[PDB]
Every structure is written in structure tokens, then in C-alpha cells.
Write a protein that binds this ligand. Structure first.
Ligand SMILES: CC(=O)N[C@@H]1[C@@H](O)[C@H](O[C@@H]2O[C@H](CO)[C@@H](O[C@@H]3O[C@H](CO)[C@@H](O[C@@H]4O[C@H](CO)[C@@H](O[C@@H]5O[C@H](CO)[C@@H](O[C@@H]6O[C@H](CO)[C@@H](O)[C@H](O)[C@H]6NC(C)=O)[C@H](O)[C@H]5NC(C)=O)[C@H](O)[C@H]4NC(C)=O)[C@H](O)[C@H]3NC(C)=O)[C@H](O)[C@H]2NC(C)=O)[C@@H](CO)O[C@H]1O
Length: 129
């Protein structure tokens, strides 16, 4: 699908992320346009041999099952492609605690540079919510 700016953010406030776990709902949406550029069909492999999945862009090495990653933990315990589909109602459940493991957004990398030290808060700006 192609989520336009105001149409790919309101879902967080539909999935339990608004002001969820010390991160304001606003502290998230910026990175989305720095992660897949509002798409769940943008995915890559990694130099590390790690593959990625979805707009979420998770790697199969540590988080989910694609099977080409042996010795991967898979604590999420669900098929990676379960995210890439246009529908995402369930897909947040893993991203939901990926921080809960205590490392924060530090698992995500772009958000420490493209949105961090900047005003992300100016990204969620203007959409009625
Ligand atoms: C296109 C776009 O927008 N983004 C681009 C992206 O697509 C490109 O590719 C990157 O792909 C990678 C995978 O190939 C994607 O995933 C991220 O990969 C990075 C790699 O650097 C991951 O970083 C490390 O991730 C591991 C796994 O979670 C981290 O380990 C956890 O850390 C916790 C705490 O921090 C640890 O816990 C405990 O620590 C205490 C300390 O006191 C200690 O007592 C314990 O012993 C210790 N636990 C043990 C026993 O280990 C624990 O080690 C572990 N827990 C877990 C596994 O949950 C590791 O710490 C991370 N590095 C640091 C340092 O924090 C990152 O986790 C991973 N994220 C995802 C989504 O899974 C990535 O999406 C993607 N890009 C990124 C990352 O932005 C890149 C090309 O390079 O370009 C992007 O732009």
C-alpha cells in the first residue's frame, strides 16, 4: 500500500502506542518516514547476513523466523511476513516490548540520528488526533 503522511500515523493511537512507555505517541511517527518511507513492502538483507522485514524493518537474525537465520532467538515467535502485509493490527505486539527488554529505541538505529537531537515532535504536527 501507499500510506500518505496523515494516513500512516493515526494507527499508533489505534495500537496502544500513544504516550506508551515513556515514549510519547509523537516521539515515534517521525522515524516511520525514515524507515520505509510509509511502506511495509520495503525490505533488505544485511551485510551481516541478517535480513529485514516490513516498514518496521526488523532483522531475522535476532527477532523472527524466515528460517535462513539459524541461531536466531525468535522470542516474537511468529512469521516475519506476518508484518509485511498491508494489514498491521497484530504486527506492533513485538515492536511493543522490543524496548521493554530495556534497551530502548537503541535497537532502532535511524531514530538516534535522523529523529534524535532534532524535533520529532514537529513531525506528528498538524494531523488531528
Ligand atoms: C532503512 C532504514 O530505515 N533503516 C536501515 C536498516 O534497514 C539497515 O539495516 C539494519 O538491519 C538490522 C539487522 O540487520 C536491523 O536491526 C537492528 O540491527 C542492529 C544492528 O546494529 C541491532 O543492534 C543490536 O541489536 C541487538 C539485538 O537486540 C542488541 O542487543 C540487545 O541489547 C540489550 C540492551 O541494550 C542487551 O541486554 C543486556 O545488557 C545488559 C547490560 O547491563 C547485560 O547485563 C546483559 O548480559 C545483556 N543481554 C545479553 C545477555 O546479551 C542484549 O545484549 C540484547 N537483547 C535483545 C536481543 O533484545 C544490541 O544491544 C544492539 N546494539 C546496541 C549497542 O544496542 C538492533 O537491535 C536491531 N533492531 C531490530 C529492529 O531488531 C535494523 O532495523 C536496520 N537498521 C537500523 C538498526 O536502524 C541499516 C544498515 O546498517 O540502515 C538503516 O538505516
Amino acid at each position: 500500500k501507499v500510506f500518505g503522511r496523515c494516513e500512516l500515523a493515526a494507527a499508533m493511537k489505534r495500537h496502544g502506542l500513544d504516550n506508551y512507555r515513556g515514549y510519547s505517541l509523537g516521539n515515534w511517527v517521525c522515524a516511520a518516514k525514515f524507515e520505509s518511507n510509509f511502506n511495509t513492502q520495503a525490505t533488505n538483507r544485511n551485510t551481516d547476513g541478517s535480513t529485514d522485514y516490513g516498514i518496521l524493518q526488523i532483522n531475522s537474525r535476532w527477532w523472527c523466523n524466515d528460517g535462513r537465520t539459524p541461531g536466531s532467538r525468535n522470542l516474537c515467535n511468529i512469521p516475519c511476513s506476518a508484518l509485511l502485509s498491508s494489514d498491521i493490527t497484530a504486527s506492533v505486539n513485538c515492536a511493543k516490548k522490543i524496548v521493554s527488554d530495556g534497551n530502548g529505541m537503541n535497537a532502532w538505529v535511524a531514530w538516534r540520528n535522523r529523529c534524535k537531537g532534532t524535533d520529532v515532535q514537529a513531525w506528528i504536527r498538524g494531523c488531528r488526533l
